[PDB]
Amino acid sequence: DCQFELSGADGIVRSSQVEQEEKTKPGQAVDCIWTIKATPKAKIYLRFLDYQMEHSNECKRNFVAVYDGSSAIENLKAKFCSTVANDV
Amino acid sequence: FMSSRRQSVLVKSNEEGIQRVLTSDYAFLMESTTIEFVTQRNCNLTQIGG
Numbered sequence: 322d323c324q325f326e327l328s329g330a331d332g333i334v335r336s337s338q339v340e341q342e343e344k345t346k347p348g349q350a351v352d353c354i355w356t357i358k359a360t361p362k363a364k365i366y367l368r369f370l371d372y373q374m375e376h377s378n379e380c381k382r383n384f385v386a387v388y389d390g391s392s393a394i395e396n397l398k399a400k401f402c403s404t405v406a407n408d409v
Numbered sequence: 410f411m412s413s414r415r416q417s418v419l420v421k422s423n424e425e426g427i428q429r430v431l432t433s434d435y436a437f438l439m440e441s442t443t444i445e446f447v448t449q450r451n452c453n454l455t456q457i458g459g
């Protein structure tokens with residue numbers, strides 16, 4: 322239940338909270354999904370201020386996917402597990 | 410560079426290539442017969458290479 326309900330003009334979702342929000346345990350399978358709500362009449366632009374994978378080019382054990390709406394592959398702009406994540 | 414930042418640097422006209430140099434810090438790769446026209450009207454732009 323790693324829920325992260327938030328909105329506003331901006332907001333910085335980090336990998337620091339996933340050990341600090343205490344919904345996880347060190348060394349177990351997570352399904353923690355961040356939820357982004359816009360301000361009314363707005364569009365969303367994810368940019369990466371930091372990006373670092375412990376197993377590069379291995380999209381089985383660590384990745385970051387970007388779903389544009391609900392959990393559907395109909396709206397899946399990009400899915401990164403390489404060294405560099407471009408901005409969507 | 411330009412493949413990684415395609416939404417940033419690549420523009421949709423020669424007109425937007427002028428404005429990004431007039432406003433931002435930009436090095437627009439224009440064809441050399443409309444560099445020889447814009448630099449005649451705007452004396453604040455130049456052809457910096459060959």
Ligand SMILES: *[C@@H]1O[C@H](CO)[C@@H](O[C@@H]2O[C@H](CO)[C@@H](O)[C@H](O)[C@H]2NC(C)=O)[C@H](O)[C@H]1NC(C)=O
Nearest residue numbers: 427428429430431432433434435436452453454
């Ligand atoms: C002096 O040179 C600068 C270029 O460095 C001219 O352009 C300014 O550049 C900033 C960003 O680099 C932008 O806000 C505008 O394109 C320009 N600003 C202003 C206030 O003009 C600048 O015009 C030149 N002249 C003066 C008097 O500063």
Ligand SMILES: *[C@@H]1O[C@H](CO)[C@@H](O)[C@H](O)[C@H]1NC(C)=O
Nearest residue numbers: 328329330331332360361363
């Ligand atoms: C966004 O702008 C409105 C006014 O246009 C302002 O009242 C509001 O505080 C701004 N948002 C934030 C998070 O400050």
Ligand SMILES: *[C@@H]1O[C@H](CO)[C@@H](O)[C@H](O)[C@H]1NC(C)=O
Nearest residue numbers: 431447449450451452453454
């Ligand atoms: C180029 O920019 C500067 C700032 O105003 C000035 O020398 C000149 O007026 C500009 N060029 C034109 C054509 O306005």
